[PDB]
């Protein structure tokens, strides 16, 4: 049975994902930035309203993952905060200017994260030396890695993704980027244990007066369909 | 005595702004989203390192200001958080579908805000009736409003801003959108009490293996404070 993780940009979307079969949620803010740390209000809101596992992303800004000491100070505090709020895991990633995992920094994040299941995000796809990196993530105690096989979308990086899976058992490899109902079977047939999807859609602004404004939300039906595909596939596997 | 407020997307940028003359900082995250609520980590960081007044923006997402019940619940908790952390003010705004200030929900925010000085942001430039909105803001107890005179840039809307300033003594009118060292004197001559500027630029990523970051320009901040100082010192 493959694990279905849905990226949500609001508490309502995470709830919709939960009610539609999602096994886990990656909680983010700012879709146009690729996902940034949610405000404390959103975090607390989700802890009070969402029951399935929620992993908040810890990312102060978009762009690269070579944070300054100031941004890093905030990141450590956010990690401690997410742990204290009771989340079972979190998502983050830090690299040096050459694309190598910043080990000293990641170790400090792991220490602050405590028992939390940490996901090293797509910073992995911007890094050099995939295997060497996986070995080091395993050394840090990273639970899983969100990756597209270092390609524009996970389907293109499918052969690489399979390589990662066959290289080490840990961290768990989670396919992400462009993963949708139409191509889910590719990942399942390849033996991917966890898949990440935005199950995104655009809802028009209800704004009647003006002078973009569409909201990026989770399509509940899309989530259910993907979970359906996952259940049948695991079933077809006898 | 014109007040210079700088929009900063990081603690370090806020510090740079402070070291260069900024009288106040609007703290935001997500420059590409037009500015969203900063995380607790960033907020705590600024409280321990920045001394001039800082007003964090409270905005869960980009786009319109007609938030869902779920988003609004988060907004109230963030107002409560910013207040509890001791910031002297905050920036936010909620509108109904017809371009009117959402009074029932804005009232709940004011209640949660307590003594904090609340700035109604550019949601104001999306309102159908500016003078009536100013009235509504004063009714709410709003301290100041960030506006471009309802134009694409504040200079273009300057004549409108001058009209707003004389209308009433409701919230303070703070000119924003396109304000920079180059055109600052226009707003000062117009009689604007407070001005807002991001005074920044997108910085290239230092990555040597394969990419931008929005940072404040401390020189620009310093130049603007100079213009302000010289203005009422001429
Ligand atoms: Ca390698």
Curated annotation (Swiss-Prot), chain A:
Q: What is this protein called?
A: PF03932 family protein CutC
Highest taxon of the lineage: Bacteria
Q: What is its main location?
A: cytoplasm
Tell me the compartments it is located in. Answer: Cytoplasm
Gene behind the chain: cutC
Q: Which GO terms describe its molecular function?
A: copper ion binding
Oligomer and partners: Homodimer.
UniProt cross-references to NCBIfam families, sorted A to Z: PRK11572.1
Which InterPro entries does the entry mention? CutC-like (IPR005627), CutC-like_dom_sf (IPR036822)
Q: Keywords of this protein's UniProt record, alphabetized?
A: Cytoplasm
Instruction: State the family it belongs to.
Output: Belongs to the CutC family.
Q: Which SUPFAM superfamilies does the entry mention?
A: CutC-like
What Pfam families does the record tag this protein with?
CutC
Write out the GO cellular component annotations: cytoplasm
